Design a protein around this nucleic acid. Sequence first.
RNA 1: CAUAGGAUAGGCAUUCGUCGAAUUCUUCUCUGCGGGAUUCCUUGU
RNA 2: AGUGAGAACAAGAAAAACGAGUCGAACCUACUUGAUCAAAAGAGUGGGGAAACCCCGGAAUCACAUAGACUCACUUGGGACCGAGGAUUGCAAUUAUUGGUCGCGCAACGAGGAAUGUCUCGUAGGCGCAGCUCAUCAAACUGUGCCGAUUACGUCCC
Lengths: 184, 110, 72, 102, 54, 152, 142
Amino acid sequence: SSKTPKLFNKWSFEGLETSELALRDHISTTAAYVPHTSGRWQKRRFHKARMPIVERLANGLMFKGRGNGRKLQAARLLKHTLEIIHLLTDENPLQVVVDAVSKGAPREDSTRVGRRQAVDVSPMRRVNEAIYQMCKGAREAAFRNLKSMPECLADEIVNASKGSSNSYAIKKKDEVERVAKANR
Amino acid sequence: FTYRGLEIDPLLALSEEEFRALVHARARRNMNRHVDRRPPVLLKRLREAKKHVKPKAVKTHLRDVVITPEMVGSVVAIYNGHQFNAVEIKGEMIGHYLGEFSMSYRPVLH
Amino acid sequence: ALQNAVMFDKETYDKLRSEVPKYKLITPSIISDRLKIAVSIAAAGLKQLCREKLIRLVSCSSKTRVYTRIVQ
Amino acid sequence: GQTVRLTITSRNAKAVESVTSQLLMRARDEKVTIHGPVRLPTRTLKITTRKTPCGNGTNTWDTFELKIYKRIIDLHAPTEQVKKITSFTMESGVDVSITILD
Amino acid sequence: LDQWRSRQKIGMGKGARCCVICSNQKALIRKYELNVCRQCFRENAEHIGFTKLR
Amino acid sequence: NKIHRIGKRKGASLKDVSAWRWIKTAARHFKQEGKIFVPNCTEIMKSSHGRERAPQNPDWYYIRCAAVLRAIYLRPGVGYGGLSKRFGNKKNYGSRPEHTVTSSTGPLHWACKSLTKLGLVEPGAQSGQRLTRKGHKFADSLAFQVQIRKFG
Amino acid sequence: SLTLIPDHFQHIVRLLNTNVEGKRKVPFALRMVKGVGIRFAYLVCKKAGIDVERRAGTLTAEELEKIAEIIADPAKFKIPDWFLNRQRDPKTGKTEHLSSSMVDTRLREDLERLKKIRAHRGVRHAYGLRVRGQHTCTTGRH
RNA sequence: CAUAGGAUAGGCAUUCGUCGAAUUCUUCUCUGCGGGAUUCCUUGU
RNA sequence: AGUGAGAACAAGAAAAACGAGUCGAACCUACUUGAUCAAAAGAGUGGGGAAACCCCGGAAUCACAUAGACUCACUUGGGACCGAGGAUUGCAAUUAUUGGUCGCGCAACGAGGAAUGUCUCGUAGGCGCAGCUCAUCAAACUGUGCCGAUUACGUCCC
Ligand SMILES: [Mg+2]
Ligand SMILES: [Mg+2]
């Protein structure tokens, strides 16, 4: 009678795969009954890639002093986010998130290694910076807006999942890659 | 002139138990804590200068005295800390401490 | 600026009962800028449409309530 | 029984056990039916002063502690039999206290 | 006249209290009703029994 | 079919239902009955000095003293001051750090005084406040109502 | 409140010589007049029989004339004596409650009372200085 | 089966100033001395 | 504005005095009262030398399908400034000791230039609570718990 968890008793983890075959090990699709787990994912170096991807959205919401430590809020705030994403897309919302993480961060970047040489981006940072730049930007959208945070977060996830440029992350994902293409 | 709806002639009449009901809360607490406490000689020497004819300026260091209507019309020379400031008790001064009328500092001018 | 009305006109309440049940993903902030009404009216206008069964309540909390059209 | 409670309090951890285990090894010889020595929680006492007598330096501190060890033993003997158990020259710094329960 | 220590007769203030070792009335430890001055305590913590464990 | 017996269990009590569902129906029972003695101060006053404005629910003295009645069911022997810790607040001081304040025991004194006149509270053997046998009958019977969804 | 707007809904109503934003709720627009505030505007809405849900511009002229005498004379409506602004009123002695133009008027009469006699709390207002026990070395900066 | 009412375990039903009696216990609690961790084991540098 | 669930460290009364060699009172506290009517009080009555009473320590973040008000505004954000009652600490409150009540809120402040500080896991940050200063007063410090992450696990660029 192990009834294979959905997510909020609603959204299944049965069909998740990743379009980016570069990013399959770093986006974890293991199942959970809630985002909150309270485990130590930061002891070892790459262990936070084994953390479930829906938890890592909840950790990205706990920013700026008004949110540090409010994980039960961010789990609630993502509960309404994933239901809105189902109404915009008519799809499994967890596949919409894994499609948003896979498109959200730039494949290439430019740093000074010695001039300002173009450097490749590891698959770990590409999962970090996609989650980082979607929680950012959805946070800045709803800062003095009529829209709630579960709508502004749901809009950044949808437009990055489609690869539209309306998302905050995809404006910066394309700005970094063209600067990296010119700083080769 | 008027203090809490009474002129100087109803003010003088009023009993000390009823004047204590008239004043504000800090003054009536000072009066309840001096019901059996041998009143200051500022008050005694204030009327010994009143009888003659402003009257004579009596000097004091006392600054935590509450002005009563019996003090009205008498010049008190209050000590700020290095000099004696000559202040005539007008009727609008009832309830205020004597230290509110002699500054112990100068206003700063740069 | 963003000057929103604080009560319904008769014209815009007719917008509430017709166009809003045709939307997918109704929220009181979607209605607040489409219909130019305050969210305190938009949330009150949508609680009315649930008890008439014109819209559906798909997700509810104390603050955030998400509504959808009923498909029949 | 009279149920006399002896309170062994001390500042030394090695002197409070050398009294209590000695006091208990006396009260087995008369077959007194004791209720065993319980270890009440040790109370530590913190005074955290500055280190400096002057004012300057890095503002360093030092916490001082003082633990009180605390034992009680309940025994059913009469009041001059418990004075037979109690009477022996103890270590310095251990207080014993005779109390009658009800 | 014996107005002599009339303010020190009433004992409410920081002047009524005193270091019992060191006779000073500045920065005394009154926790556990100890009443030793701050500096004169660190010289005497080992005889009172306090040792710095941590 | 959300209301039915689960297995062999046949009844309810407090701590078997939702806490707000009990307090809301008990507040609903008190005003529909009418035998409550709402004081005249509850119109003017505020529940504590830690609250910054008035309770803005016109049934607030009914929701209080139903929460208090639940707070005698759990913790018998509770006084007015133990109830003040239950309903206390974090007070907003202006530019100073916020500190916890316990609620005014005045309204908690009226709340227990009203419930004694119902007969639902007894003044305790030695401690503060105790639930009368009529109150155990009231608290559990109303709590069975809220699981079979008869909120009224 | 799921009710249509009336034909007479003023966006700015005028009560006690004060403009009042009729788009707001009824107490929170009734605190815009001086002397009222939130804790007293809920008592003016309670003693007038005004529902707190309604917006301030729907208040009719018979409802606004009832409000203005709850604020001008609140002790006739059993709003208690401790609730009022000016309770023991030196040089008058009588408990009042000061309306819009009267708060600033008698505030100037209190600062003039303490400056006629040379009381220290009136000397601080003459120099523009801080009046209570603030330090005013690092934080005035006016 | 809430005014509109979702999601979520199930031999002897359950609850406890009830200021009950009894009669068996150390699971948690307290704590004086003591175990336990050593690169110990494993397979690349 | 309600309502729920629910921590750890801790503190606590007195002398060769004044009273009945023994006992009292000073200290913290529950509980009742005040209450046929605001807080803040003021009073009774118990208990506690502190694992024994406070205490089933009802902290605050948080939580809530609370069918609660606000709805993007210098606004129900913010609470500086000061006006008027009142009550406690003290031998004394004026150059408000502190609390509480109603006003004021039309005081900046809409996320901060050049610069700059701390930090690698139960951590940062947030959140309160004790103790210490203390008759009265914490935006302090010493402690303690609660909620709980981002990033790196590198390098000699500064
Ligand atoms: Mg002490
Ligand atoms: Mg600048």
